Design a protein around this nucleic acid. Structure first.
Lengths: 44, 50, 49, 48
DNA sequence: ACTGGCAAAACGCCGGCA
DNA sequence: TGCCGGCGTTTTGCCAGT
Protein backbone atom coordinates (compact mmCIF):
# COMPACT_ATOMS: atom_id res chain seq x y z
CA UNK A 1 0.00 0.00 0.00
CA UNK A 2 1.25 3.49 -0.93
CA UNK A 3 1.82 6.16 1.70
CA UNK A 4 1.77 9.94 1.94
CA UNK A 5 3.77 11.86 4.55
CA UNK A 6 1.61 14.77 5.73
CA UNK A 7 3.12 17.96 7.08
CA UNK A 8 0.67 18.94 9.81
CA UNK A 9 -0.13 22.34 11.36
CA UNK A 10 0.60 23.30 15.00
CA UNK A 11 -2.37 21.80 16.87
CA UNK A 12 -3.30 18.68 14.89
CA UNK A 13 -0.34 16.48 15.85
CA UNK A 14 -1.54 15.82 19.40
CA UNK A 15 -5.26 16.50 18.81
CA UNK A 16 -5.27 13.71 16.22
CA UNK A 17 -3.88 11.16 18.71
CA UNK A 18 -6.41 12.16 21.38
CA UNK A 19 -9.38 11.23 19.19
CA UNK A 20 -7.68 8.00 18.06
CA UNK A 21 -7.42 6.45 21.54
CA UNK A 22 -10.94 7.58 22.49
CA UNK A 23 -12.06 5.80 19.30
CA UNK A 24 -9.93 2.73 20.10
CA UNK A 25 -8.07 2.72 16.77
CA UNK A 26 -4.61 3.78 15.57
CA UNK A 27 -3.82 7.29 14.31
CA UNK A 28 -3.51 6.14 10.70
CA UNK A 29 -6.85 4.38 11.26
CA UNK A 30 -8.40 7.65 12.44
CA UNK A 31 -7.06 9.87 9.65
CA UNK A 32 -8.14 7.48 6.89
CA UNK A 33 -11.58 7.03 8.48
CA UNK A 34 -12.08 10.82 8.59
CA UNK A 35 -10.70 11.22 5.08
CA UNK A 36 -13.18 8.74 3.61
CA UNK A 37 -16.07 10.46 5.38
CA UNK A 38 -14.97 13.79 3.87
CA UNK A 39 -14.75 12.23 0.41
CA UNK A 40 -18.24 10.79 0.93
CA UNK A 41 -19.63 14.26 1.73
CA UNK A 42 -18.56 15.20 -1.82
CA UNK A 43 -20.92 12.54 -3.24
CA UNK A 44 -23.81 14.94 -2.49
CA UNK B 1 9.87 28.98 14.59
CA UNK B 2 7.27 26.76 12.87
CA UNK B 3 8.01 26.45 9.16
CA UNK B 4 7.24 23.55 6.83
CA UNK B 5 10.61 21.93 7.60
CA UNK B 6 9.75 22.13 11.31
CA UNK B 7 6.14 20.88 10.95
CA UNK B 8 4.97 17.50 12.30
CA UNK B 9 5.21 14.91 9.52
CA UNK B 10 2.97 11.81 9.60
CA UNK B 11 2.94 8.94 7.09
CA UNK B 12 -0.62 8.03 6.11
CA UNK B 13 -0.78 4.51 4.68
CA UNK B 14 -3.52 4.94 2.09
CA UNK B 15 -5.85 2.13 0.96
CA UNK B 16 -5.81 1.13 -2.72
CA UNK B 17 -6.63 3.96 -5.13
CA UNK B 18 -7.68 6.31 -2.33
CA UNK B 19 -4.58 8.37 -3.05
CA UNK B 20 -5.73 8.84 -6.65
CA UNK B 21 -9.10 9.85 -5.21
CA UNK B 22 -7.60 12.62 -3.06
CA UNK B 23 -5.53 13.78 -6.05
CA UNK B 24 -8.57 14.34 -8.27
CA UNK B 25 -10.24 16.33 -5.49
CA UNK B 26 -7.05 18.29 -4.75
CA UNK B 27 -6.63 19.41 -8.38
CA UNK B 28 -10.25 20.53 -8.68
CA UNK B 29 -10.06 22.53 -5.45
CA UNK B 30 -6.77 24.09 -6.57
CA UNK B 31 -4.70 23.03 -3.57
CA UNK B 32 -1.67 20.84 -2.86
CA UNK B 33 -2.29 17.33 -1.62
CA UNK B 34 -1.01 18.30 1.79
CA UNK B 35 -3.45 21.22 2.05
CA UNK B 36 -6.18 18.94 0.75
CA UNK B 37 -5.67 16.40 3.57
CA UNK B 38 -5.34 19.18 6.17
CA UNK B 39 -8.48 21.01 5.01
CA UNK B 40 -10.57 17.83 5.23
CA UNK B 41 -9.17 16.75 8.61
CA UNK B 42 -9.61 20.25 10.07
CA UNK B 43 -13.23 20.30 8.93
CA UNK B 44 -13.91 16.75 10.16
CA UNK B 45 -12.44 17.68 13.55
CA UNK B 46 -14.53 20.86 13.88
CA UNK B 47 -17.77 19.01 13.09
CA UNK B 48 -17.36 16.91 16.25
CA UNK B 49 -16.38 20.03 18.25
CA UNK B 50 -19.63 21.90 17.49
CA UNK C 1 5.70 22.95 -21.53
CA UNK C 2 3.43 24.87 -19.14
CA UNK C 3 4.69 25.00 -15.55
CA UNK C 4 4.07 27.73 -12.96
CA UNK C 5 7.17 29.66 -14.07
CA UNK C 6 5.81 29.55 -17.64
CA UNK C 7 2.19 30.54 -16.89
CA UNK C 8 0.57 33.72 -18.25
CA UNK C 9 0.95 36.60 -15.82
CA UNK C 10 -1.62 39.36 -15.42
CA UNK C 11 -1.10 42.20 -12.97
CA UNK C 12 -4.42 42.80 -11.21
CA UNK C 13 -4.94 46.26 -9.73
CA UNK C 14 -7.03 45.56 -6.62
CA UNK C 15 -9.31 48.07 -4.87
CA UNK C 16 -9.12 49.17 -1.22
CA UNK C 17 -8.55 46.25 1.17
CA UNK C 18 -9.38 43.43 -1.26
CA UNK C 19 -5.84 42.09 -0.84
CA UNK C 20 -6.11 41.27 2.88
CA UNK C 21 -9.65 40.04 2.29
CA UNK C 22 -8.41 37.60 -0.36
CA UNK C 23 -5.40 36.50 1.73
CA UNK C 24 -7.69 35.79 4.70
CA UNK C 25 -10.06 33.62 2.68
CA UNK C 26 -7.00 32.01 1.02
CA UNK C 27 -5.59 30.83 4.37
CA UNK C 28 -9.12 29.95 5.43
CA UNK C 29 -9.17 27.50 2.51
CA UNK C 30 -5.54 26.30 2.72
CA UNK C 31 -4.54 27.84 -0.59
CA UNK C 32 -2.09 30.33 -2.06
CA UNK C 33 -3.63 33.68 -3.00
CA UNK C 34 -2.97 32.78 -6.61
CA UNK C 35 -4.84 29.46 -6.40
CA UNK C 36 -7.50 31.21 -4.34
CA UNK C 37 -8.04 33.80 -7.11
CA UNK C 38 -7.95 31.21 -9.92
CA UNK C 39 -10.42 29.01 -8.03
CA UNK C 40 -13.01 31.78 -7.69
CA UNK C 41 -12.52 33.09 -11.24
CA UNK C 42 -12.89 29.57 -12.61
CA UNK C 43 -16.12 28.94 -10.71
CA UNK C 44 -17.44 32.31 -11.82
CA UNK C 45 -16.75 31.49 -15.48
CA UNK C 46 -18.37 28.05 -15.76
CA UNK C 47 -21.33 29.45 -13.82
CA UNK C 48 -21.70 31.73 -16.87
CA UNK C 49 -21.65 28.67 -19.17
CA UNK D 1 -4.71 50.67 -5.81
CA UNK D 2 -2.14 47.95 -5.03
CA UNK D 3 -1.04 45.32 -7.54
CA UNK D 4 -0.96 41.52 -7.46
CA UNK D 5 0.44 39.48 -10.36
CA UNK D 6 -1.71 36.42 -11.10
CA UNK D 7 -0.38 33.34 -12.85
CA UNK D 8 -3.34 32.05 -14.84
CA UNK D 9 -3.53 28.46 -16.16
CA UNK D 10 -3.55 27.51 -19.86
CA UNK D 11 -6.84 28.80 -21.28
CA UNK D 12 -7.79 31.37 -18.63
CA UNK D 13 -6.41 34.52 -20.25
CA UNK D 14 -8.36 34.16 -23.51
CA UNK D 15 -11.36 32.97 -21.52
CA UNK D 16 -11.39 36.09 -19.36
CA UNK D 17 -10.60 38.27 -22.37
CA UNK D 18 -13.73 37.06 -24.17
CA UNK D 19 -16.06 37.56 -21.22
CA UNK D 20 -14.65 41.05 -20.59
CA UNK D 21 -15.25 41.99 -24.23
CA UNK D 22 -18.74 40.60 -23.78
CA UNK D 23 -19.44 42.84 -20.76
CA UNK D 24 -17.75 45.89 -22.36
CA UNK D 25 -15.21 46.08 -19.52
CA UNK D 26 -11.48 46.22 -18.98
CA UNK D 27 -9.95 42.81 -18.27
CA UNK D 28 -8.92 43.99 -14.81
CA UNK D 29 -12.46 45.33 -14.30
CA UNK D 30 -13.87 41.95 -15.29
CA UNK D 31 -11.51 40.08 -12.94
CA UNK D 32 -12.33 42.35 -10.02
CA UNK D 33 -16.08 42.40 -10.69
CA UNK D 34 -15.95 38.61 -10.56
CA UNK D 35 -13.63 38.36 -7.55
CA UNK D 36 -15.99 40.82 -5.83
CA UNK D 37 -19.24 38.92 -6.28
CA UNK D 38 -17.38 35.70 -5.48
CA UNK D 39 -16.27 37.02 -2.10
CA UNK D 40 -19.56 38.48 -0.87
CA UNK D 41 -21.35 35.40 -2.26
CA UNK D 42 -19.65 33.05 0.21
CA UNK D 43 -19.46 35.95 2.68
CA UNK D 44 -23.25 35.63 2.62
CA UNK D 45 -22.96 32.12 4.07
CA UNK D 46 -23.83 33.53 7.50
CA UNK D 47 -26.15 30.58 8.24
CA UNK D 48 -26.73 29.83 4.52
C1' DA E 1 2.18 46.40 -19.76
C1' DC E 2 4.70 42.17 -19.93
C1' DT E 3 7.69 38.60 -18.22
C1' DG E 4 12.51 36.45 -16.71
C1' DG E 5 13.67 35.30 -12.56
C1' DC E 6 14.96 35.60 -7.40
C1' DA E 7 14.63 34.40 -2.85
C1' DA E 8 11.84 32.10 0.01
C1' DA E 9 8.32 28.91 1.01
C1' DA E 10 5.79 24.78 0.33
C1' DC E 11 5.73 19.76 -1.68
C1' DG E 12 6.50 15.24 -2.29
C1' DC E 13 9.18 11.68 -0.76
C1' DC E 14 12.88 9.03 0.86
C1' DG E 15 15.22 6.44 4.17
C1' DG E 16 16.32 6.21 8.20
C1' DC E 17 14.94 6.43 13.17
C1' DA E 18 12.25 4.72 17.57
C1' DT F 1 2.63 1.85 14.42
C1' DG F 2 4.81 6.46 15.14
C1' DC F 3 8.61 10.00 14.09
C1' DC F 4 11.67 13.13 11.35
C1' DG F 5 16.16 15.35 8.87
C1' DG F 6 16.70 16.62 4.76
C1' DC F 7 17.06 15.97 -0.68
C1' DG F 8 15.49 17.83 -4.84
C1' DT F 9 11.76 19.87 -6.72
C1' DT F 10 7.85 23.20 -7.93
C1' DT F 11 5.22 27.16 -6.50
C1' DT F 12 4.50 31.87 -4.72
C1' DG F 13 4.84 36.57 -4.04
C1' DC F 14 6.96 40.25 -6.03
C1' DC F 15 9.95 42.60 -8.08
C1' DA F 16 13.19 45.22 -11.57
C1' DG F 17 14.43 45.20 -16.67
C1' DT F 18 12.58 45.55 -21.10
Amino acid sequence: ADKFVVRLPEGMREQIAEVARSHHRSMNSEIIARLEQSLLQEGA
